[PDB]
Each structure stands twice: as structure tokens, then as C-alpha cells.
Amino acid sequence: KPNIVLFYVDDLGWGDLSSYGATEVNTPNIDALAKNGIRFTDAHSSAATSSPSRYSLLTGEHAFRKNIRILKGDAPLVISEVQKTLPKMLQTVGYRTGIVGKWHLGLGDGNTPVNWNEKVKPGPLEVGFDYSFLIPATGDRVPSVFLENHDVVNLEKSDPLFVNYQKKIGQRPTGYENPELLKQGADEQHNKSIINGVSRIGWMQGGESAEWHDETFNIVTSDKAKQFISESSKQPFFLLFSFHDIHVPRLPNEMFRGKTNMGARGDSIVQMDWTTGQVVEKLRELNLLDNTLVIFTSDNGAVLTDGYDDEALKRIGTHKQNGPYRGGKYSIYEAGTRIPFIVHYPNRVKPGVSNSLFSQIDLYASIAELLGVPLEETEAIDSQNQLSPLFDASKLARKTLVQETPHAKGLRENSWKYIRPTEKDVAWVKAKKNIDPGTSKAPQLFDLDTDPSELHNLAAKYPDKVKLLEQKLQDIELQSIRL
Amino acid sequence: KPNIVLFYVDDLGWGDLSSYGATEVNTPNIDALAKNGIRFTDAHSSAATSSPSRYSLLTGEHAFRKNIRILKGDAPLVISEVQKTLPKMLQTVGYRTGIVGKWHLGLGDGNTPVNWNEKVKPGPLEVGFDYSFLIPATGDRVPSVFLENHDVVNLEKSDPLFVNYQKKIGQRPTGYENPELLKQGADEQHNKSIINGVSRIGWMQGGESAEWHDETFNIVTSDKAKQFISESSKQPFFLLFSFHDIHVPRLPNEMFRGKTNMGARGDSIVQMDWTTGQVVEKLRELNLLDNTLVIFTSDNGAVLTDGYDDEALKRIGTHKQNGPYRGGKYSIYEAGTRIPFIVHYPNRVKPGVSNSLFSQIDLYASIAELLGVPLEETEAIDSQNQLSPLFDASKLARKTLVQETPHAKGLRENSWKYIRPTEKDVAWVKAKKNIDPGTSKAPQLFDLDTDPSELHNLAAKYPDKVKLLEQKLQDIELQSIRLK
Ligand SMILES: O=S(=O)(O)OC[C@H]1O[C@H](O[C@H]2[C@@H](O)[C@@H](CO)O[C@@H](O[C@@H]3[C@H](O)[C@@H](OS(=O)(=O)O)[C@@H](O)O[C@@H]3COS(=O)(=O)O)[C@@H]2OS(=O)(=O)O)[C@H](O)[C@@H](O)[C@H]1O
Numbered sequence A: 001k002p003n004i005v006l007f008y009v010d011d012l013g014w015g016d017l018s019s020y021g022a023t024e025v026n027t028p029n030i031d032a033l034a035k036n037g038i039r040f041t042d043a044h045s046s047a048a049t050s051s052p053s054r055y056s057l058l059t060g061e062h063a064f065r066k067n068i069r070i071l072k073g074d075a076p077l078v079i080s081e082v083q084k085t086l087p088k089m090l091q092t093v094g095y096r097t098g099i100v101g102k103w104h105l106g107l108g109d110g111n112t113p114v115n116w117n118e119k120v121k122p123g124p125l126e127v128g129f130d131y132s133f134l135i136p137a138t139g140d141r142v143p144s145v146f147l148e149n150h151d152v153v154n155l156e157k158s159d160p161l162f163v164n165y166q167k168k169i170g171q172r173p174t175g176y177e178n179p180e181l182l183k184q185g186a187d188e189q190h191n192k193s194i195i196n197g198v199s200r201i202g203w204m205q206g207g208e209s210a211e212w213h214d215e216t217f218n219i220v221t222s223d224k225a226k227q228f229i230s231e232s233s234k235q236p237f238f239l240l241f242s243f244h245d246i247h248v249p250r251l252p253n254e255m256f257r258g259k260t261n262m263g264a265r266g267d268s269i270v271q272m273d274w275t276t277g278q279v280v281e282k283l284r285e286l287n288l289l290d291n292t293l294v295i296f297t298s299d300n301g302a303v304l305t306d307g308y309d310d311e312a313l314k315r316i317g318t319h320k321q322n323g324p325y326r327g328g329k330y331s332i333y334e335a336g337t338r339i340p341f342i343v344h345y346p347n348r349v350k351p352g353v354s355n356s357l358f359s360q361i362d363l364y365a366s367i368a369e370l371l372g373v374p375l376e377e378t379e380a381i382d383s384q385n386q387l388s389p390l391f392d393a394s395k396l397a398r399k400t401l402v403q404e405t406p407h408a409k410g411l412r413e414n415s416w417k418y419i420r421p422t423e424k425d426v427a428w429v430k431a432k433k434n435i436d437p438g439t440s441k442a443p444q445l446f447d448l449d450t451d452p453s454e455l456h457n458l459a460a461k462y463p464d465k466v467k468l469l470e471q472k473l474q475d476i477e478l479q480s481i482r483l
Numbered sequence B: 001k002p003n004i005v006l007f008y009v010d011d012l013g014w015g016d017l018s019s020y021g022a023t024e025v026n027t028p029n030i031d032a033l034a035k036n037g038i039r040f041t042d043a044h045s046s047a048a049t050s051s052p053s054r055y056s057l058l059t060g061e062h063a064f065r066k067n068i069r070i071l072k073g074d075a076p077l078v079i080s081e082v083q084k085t086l087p088k089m090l091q092t093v094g095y096r097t098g099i100v101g102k103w104h105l106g107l108g109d110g111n112t113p114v115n116w117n118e119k120v121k122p123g124p125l126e127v128g129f130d131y132s133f134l135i136p137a138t139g140d141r142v143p144s145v146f147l148e149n150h151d152v153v154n155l156e157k158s159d160p161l162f163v164n165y166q167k168k169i170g171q172r173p174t175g176y177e178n179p180e181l182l183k184q185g186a187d188e189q190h191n192k193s194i195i196n197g198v199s200r201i202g203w204m205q206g207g208e209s210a211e212w213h214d215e216t217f218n219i220v221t222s223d224k225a226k227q228f229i230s231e232s233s234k235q236p237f238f239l240l241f242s243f244h245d246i247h248v249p250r251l252p253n254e255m256f257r258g259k260t261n262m263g264a265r266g267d268s269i270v271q272m273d274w275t276t277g278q279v280v281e282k283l284r285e286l287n288l289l290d291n292t293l294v295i296f297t298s299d300n301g302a303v304l305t306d307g308y309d310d311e312a313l314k315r316i317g318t319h320k321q322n323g324p325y326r327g328g329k330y331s332i333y334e335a336g337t338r339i340p341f342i343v344h345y346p347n348r349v350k351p352g353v354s355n356s357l358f359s360q361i362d363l364y365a366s367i368a369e370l371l372g373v374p375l376e377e378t379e380a381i382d383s384q385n386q387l388s389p390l391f392d393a394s395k396l397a398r399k400t401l402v403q404e405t406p407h408a409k410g411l412r413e414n415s416w417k418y419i420r421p422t423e424k425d426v427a428w429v430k431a432k433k434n435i436d437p438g439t440s441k442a443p444q445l446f447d448l449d450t451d452p453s454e455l456h457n458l459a460a461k462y463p464d465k466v467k468l469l470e471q472k473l474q475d476i477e478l479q480s481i482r483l484k
């Protein structure tokens, strides 16, 4: 029973790592993991946005089965208290489970809004986690406080904490009223309550003692992960290290500012690599690294301009955050879900590069197979046993895989890519995010071997292929049991 | 005997046209040719630099056979006067042949330096062209004058013209002396004589009346091309419209400044498309567009920072000038030679998109086949007959193609790409050009189907494939006669 450490980066694109070809940023720690492990070139998150991908990561099922969308800071937990989750699965075989970082899976129960001043339940502790130290929503969503287990860290009863997303509450300055105090400019959605010089989404009243310090996320989070690892060093443990990097607002520690010529976004990649090093080296000191299944991946494709004036697009230079793939965050094109995926397990995995169609949804069933945990017919219905290609870069994995986004759905059948037509008009992606969302009123079909960036639609040349793929996409939607 | 008009752009990247996916720039006129003809996605120039590719375009053979490198402004002509060339071949079937634009193939005879004040021979007129309106070297190399046939245009005997690439000559202001006069900053190689407010490579003395005006290149070149077309409308003709766009310095006409959010480089693409349109509309106006074989392609891959402070890199935004391919100008990676290539011929070409491995070198032998011109065994020894894939997107073309750059040679065998190792160190490509030259002390091998940006070197996992690909490269280097 090896330990499992899951590095889950926020918005890390296929090309944002030097082992994936980046030249404007060096990721040495993550690169050494790829060198002594398997690097996947065709691995995918379940969706093109955070909440849905995180839901599939932990439940082994497609996010559309529960219509998961980007959650707001006070949304209720999307994972039922009895739902079968990956951490619960590992618990039944003695693993001590923990998560350090971003949650974004909801925290309340729905009936009554979240009272950030009393115990916050259900949450990570109710869906398979023993220990939890989180960032409730996202780095840019209030509350800007750490929630340990069931309690908000450093909360003073003398200064109760409240949040509101529709109107201003409290006496904190905002970005629209007080733009003078901002460290970075913000768009309309992100110009509310200011905390640590940066406005966020929504208003935050009180709880000043519970306020976090963005520039120390690297230290605070690595410190917690190292402690949890030290506490569970003599037993099997699973640690989901969920980063805030490289999600907006990008506020890296001063020791990284200027390490790249790309601005805060690039420097956040440097910080992210450093943080990863702290955890990896911690496992090395305790001689646990060779017997640890390390998985380094991301929740969705990269984005440059995501709401703050941080120079991501202006100073991009020659950097290709999505490598050769088109799209990015929010998009149905490859880059929306095609991301970095590294497996590092020296005791059982030989170094290699895998071009197998791999999905993060299959982590649940592949880890069950690793430890012999039989799965119910109703458990992680979409998660397939793909442990063999996970540990051998030469083995094949999937043939078919559905890609999700709020705007459209798509399907991969070997090198074929099909995007189902939609009438939804989503211009905010192209306008505000500088990404083609991939929608179209007409079907789309691409051969990624000759057209890797999805520039030549073949829907009209192979109309039966479109119908076949559309048919197989319907079957997967109608599926309700395993296999 | 259809008319043949060949548009040859300078440094146009695979993704610089909107019909190849560009979103930050619009090329409506050029896209119109793609919608009505074949768009090639795996077509390649012979080399990753100007002069080597141009030589291969007109001689039908690899440039390394004569060690052609980027030519200085006063270089002698690299095409022998007795050497068979594509324009000559067309001359023997009654075609009137002309060239308007960038030459960059040398002009002296090699024994004496070109005297710009006398007739310049041998030039395009001695290698198969009837008419020629030229930019001698490049927009950034002196002389900054026009050469029509054998004489410099608007040259006054009262002000003789001289060039010198080793030391300053004449009284013209320079970039290293008069920075306050420049419209754009220039690196050390481009800070010499100032002409029209932009320093160039080399020093220019005299010939003021013959100086060109960069910003009106679009009008001067399109007018010359329109005259030539208008006059040869009675006879079959071959026009090589060799663009300066989008090479440095990028000085588009006023009517295009601000059309894109990428600065001078992006606005030159706009001007480039407009100039192309002016020529296409002249063919239509004269009812020749349908009976005209129009080929639109590029001499080598794209570059952003090439010598002038023109914001090409600071304002690139989301533009992917090279599409998904790695490298660019000067590189042995795909983007060095993988370029836009469109064939517009309404009387014999149906609209399509072709993924066939296609080489510009084959244009000589494919056009010969179109006209039934038998080729000698020692002529265009690298030019293969690929007329079937040139006119039908569904037909295959090449299986093997050798790629050139001064530091390394490469080979393509279907989707496999092999880069022969080299001890050469070209640091300026990364330092100043912001492009990866593709050099490596060790062999490189890629599967472009799974690794389109050549990121995963497979040379170690397939040592026999490397050997076989390296062997195939030697055979093409030793070949001296036509194949098959
Ligand atoms: O018409 S095009 O082919 O499309 O444009 C041609 C370009 O010519 C220049 O670019 C380089 C080219 O001449 C190359 C020859 O293969 O040599 C390069 O010079 C390098 C160094 O760059 C140079 O640096 S310097 O301080 O500015 O003088 C110097 O170190 O010498 C080497 C040559 O040695 S070698 O080629 O390895 O054997 C040219 O680039 S540059 O000097 O860096 O600017 C031109 O710069 C481009 O604008 C195009 O005009």
C-alpha cells in the first residue's frame, strides 16, 4: 500500500511546464518528476473549469451527471454525504486522507446559508477526508480565509465573518470605490471587497483576524502538507495538494517576482514548482518517495486574461501555455481539457512518455484496482480500470472519452475529435478571456493527427462519422452503471 | 498554356493568414483564393531562409548543392547563366516571364563588384526573365533603390551610387550616429545608413534621386505587376510577385497602420493581403483569373524580433504566427519550412484542403508536366513531378523530403522528422531571433502525428529508424541526376 500525493494545479496548461516544452519558465522540480516517471501527452481533466473537474476527480463520474458548474464562495457541497468518493475508498483500506489547498466543491448543506462563524459542515471531512486545510472557494472569491477541518482559522468571536455576493456589506473598501488601493487592476466581476490590496468577487464583512496573505500561500500550504505527511509517515496516506497557483489573482511570494519575463502569471508557475519541490523533498527526507504514487496534474487548460490587469497577455512573449492545442480554459477544443499529467512511482513505474488517451476520471477505478477494492455497479460509473497504462507508458488506455464544458460537449475516439453543435452564444469567452470557446451551430469533426489545433472541420467530409460519434456521446449520457 | 502568377511572401508563417487560423489579422483576399482552390497544410519551402529557398524555387534543386546562404546586398548571382531554370523552361513554350519585388539571388558576375552606375549583369534577365522590377537584396540591405531590368531606377549620373558593407562611405546619416532620426530602433547589424528614416545593413553613398519609399512599396509593386499583366494579356505569362512583406523593416502604408493590434508586423500582413488582392482583381478585370494558375506561398517561416524595435513580440497577443509548429525562420524544426501554400486555378482545381507532404522544389517539374516539357536528366534533379497532388487535394505527393538550414539538415519520411546532429553553435537564433534553431549534438527524431511541435525526441527508442533516415539523407545528398 503506497502513499498517494496528488498535486492538482489550478489552470496549468499543457505547455506551462518546461518538461512540456516551455522556454520562458523553468519547472525543475516538476521536470525531475517527469524524468523519473511517466509524462502523458494526451491526458485530460474531465472538464474545462474547476468545480466540474474536481467533482469528477473525487467521484469517478462525469460532472454533467450532476450539472456541476463553477461554484460561488457560499455554494453548498455538491458531493453527497453518502456518495462513494476516492478518499472514502482509500479509507476502507486503511489510508489516512487529507487535502491542503483549494476546495471549490461547496461547503454548506443548502437548507441554511453557510454561517462562517460556527462549524462548517458538511465538507471535506464528510466526503472521505480525515484532515482538511482549505481555501473555501477560489483565490479570487470571498471569504479570503482558511477553513481548517470545520473551523475558520484565526476567527475572533469579537469580529464575526459574513459574505454577500449581491450587495455590499461591511466597511471594507472595494475596487470600484477605492481603485487607488489596488495592487492589480480588476474587471467588474472582480472589483468588490479588497483584501490584501486585491479586490475579489463578492463582499466580505468582518473576520479581519481570519484574513489570509496571498503572497504566503506557498509557505502556509507547503507547511501544512509537510506536517500532515510527517504525521502519517508510518502508515498509508493520501494527500490531495490543491494549489491556488496559477489561478487569478496571481500574487506570488516576493522570492519569485521577476524569476520570469512573463509577469505574475509566469512567476506563479515558478512558485508552484517550488511548492511542489517542498513536498517532494519532504517525502525524500522521510525515505517515502520511492513508495509513493505521485500524480501531478491540473484541473483545466490555461488562461491568460482572467479578470485582473496582471500583464499575462501583454508579456506572454514566445510562451505557448497550451502548446500546440487550440482553446484553453472554458473551451471545448483540446486545450480545454488536455493538460499536464505526470506519474512518479519509482518502486513500480519505469520512466516513459505516454501518448495514450488518458482521463483523470479513471483515477478512482485504477487506484481501486491497485489496492483490490471492488466497486459497486453504481460507484464511479465512468471511471475505468486504466492502471496498466498509468504505470507503463507503452500500454494503451482509452479509445473514447467525453469532454465537458458549460457551453458544449465533445467526444474523442482515438485521434478523432467531435464537438456537438449548440446555439448558445458565449461571446464572453472570446471577448473577456481571449479564448475561442469552440461553440458552433454546425457539428465539428477534426483529425488531430493532421490537424492538431482543430483548424480544419471535417464534419461535411465524414457525415456518418459525426452521427456515429454523436450517437456514442448519447450512449455515455444515458449510461447509469459501470462498464 | 495557362497564365502562371506566383506570389512569394517574405517570412510568412504557417498561421499568419486567417485561412490558416489567424484571429488577430484578417487576410480576406488571400483567404478567397483558399476557398476556391487547395490549401496545403504540409507544404514546405526548401529552406528556412530567403536566398536558399528562392534558388530552389527557380532551379528545382536543393540549395545545399551550391552552398547557398543568406546573400549580402552586393553578392554575385548564384544561378548560372547556362543553368536551366523554371522561367527559362517556360520561355521555351511561348511564355512571357517577369518578376516584380525582392530578388536576393545576387547580381554581379563574381569577377568585379556590381557597379550600380552601369548596367547590372547578369541579373534576372540572364536566368530566364524578360521583365524585372526588383528590390536588389532585401528591404534592410543597401542599396535601398529599385532595379528595373539592367538599370537603377531614377539614377542621376550627377549623383553616382555606391555601397560598402565593411566601412562607412558617403555622407548619409547612420543609426549608430543619429538615433534621434530613426522611426524604429535597430540592432548592431541594422544601424548603418539611414534611408527614409530607417537604418539599414551596409552603407549607401549617393543615388539620392533613386532612393525608394518603403511605405509605398504596395503601390509601386502592385502598379508594376498590373502593367506587366495588362501588357502580356495577349500571350501566356509567368509573373513572380516577390514581396518585401513581411520582412523587416516593416513599414506598411498609412492606409494599413492600426488595422491590427500587433503593430507593424501585423499591419504588414494586412498590406500584403491588399497588394495580393490588387493583382488578383486585375486578373479578374481582364478575365484571366479562371485560366490563371495562381500559387501563393512563402520563402521560409515566420520571425517576430528580426532586428528592429517594432513591437512584434511585445504585442503578439494570442497570435500564433507559426501555427502549432515549433521553430520558425532559421530553424530546422517544422516551422522553418512549413509554410502557407495555396493553389488557385478555377479551370482545373476544385476547392480542397491537402495534407500531402509537398515541396516547393517540385514546382519546376510539376509545371513542366503541365506543359509537357521533357526535362533533361541533369535538370531540376530534385524537382519531382507532383502535378496530380498540386491540382487535387485528395492525391498524395511526397513520402520523403529533405529540409535545409545552414547548421543542420533534416529529413521528412511521412510523419517522421529526423534532424541530423551537428556540433555547430548558433546562439544568435535563440538570443536575437527568439527562435529555437533545432541544433543538437545528438540525433533527433519525431513522430509529428503524436508530437506535432517536436517536443519528444524518439532517436533513442528507434535507433534503426534514425540510421535509415540518416541513410536516406545521404542518398539525396549524393544524387546527381533525376530520380525514377
Ligand atoms: O532575407 S531573409 O533570409 O529572410 O533575412 C535574412 C536576415 O539576415 C540577417 O539575419 C542573420 C543572417 O545573416 C545569418 C546568416 O545565416 O547571420 C546572422 O548574424 C549572426 C549574428 O546574428 C550576428 O550578430 S550581430 O551583433 O548583430 O552582428 C553576428 O554574431 O554574426 C552571426 C553570423 O554568423 S553565422 O550566420 O552563424 O555563420 C544574421 O542576424 S543578426 O546579425 O543577428 O541580426 C538579418 O539580421 C535579418 O534581419 C534578416 O535580414
Ligand SMILES: O=S(=O)(O)OC[C@H]1O[C@@H](O)[C@H](O)[C@@H](O)[C@H]1O
Pocket: A010, A011, A049, A050, A051, A070, A104, A138, A140, A189, A247, A248, A306, A307
Ligand atoms: O478556475 S475556476 O475556479 O474554474 O475559475 C472560475 C472563474 O470564473 C470566471 O467567470 C471568473 O471571471 C474567473 O476569474 C475565474 O474565477
Ligand SMILES: [Ca+2]
Pocket: A010, A011, A049, A050, A247, A299, A300
Ligand atoms: Ca481552474
Ligand SMILES: [Ca+2]
Pocket: B009, B010, B011, B049, B050, B247, B299, B300
Ligand atoms: Ca524570408
Ligand SMILES: [Cl-]
Pocket: A156, A157, A158
Ligand atoms: Cl475573541
Ligand SMILES: [Cl-]
Pocket: A457
Ligand atoms: Cl467551420
Ligand SMILES: [Cl-]
Pocket: B261, B262, B315
Ligand atoms: Cl493593442
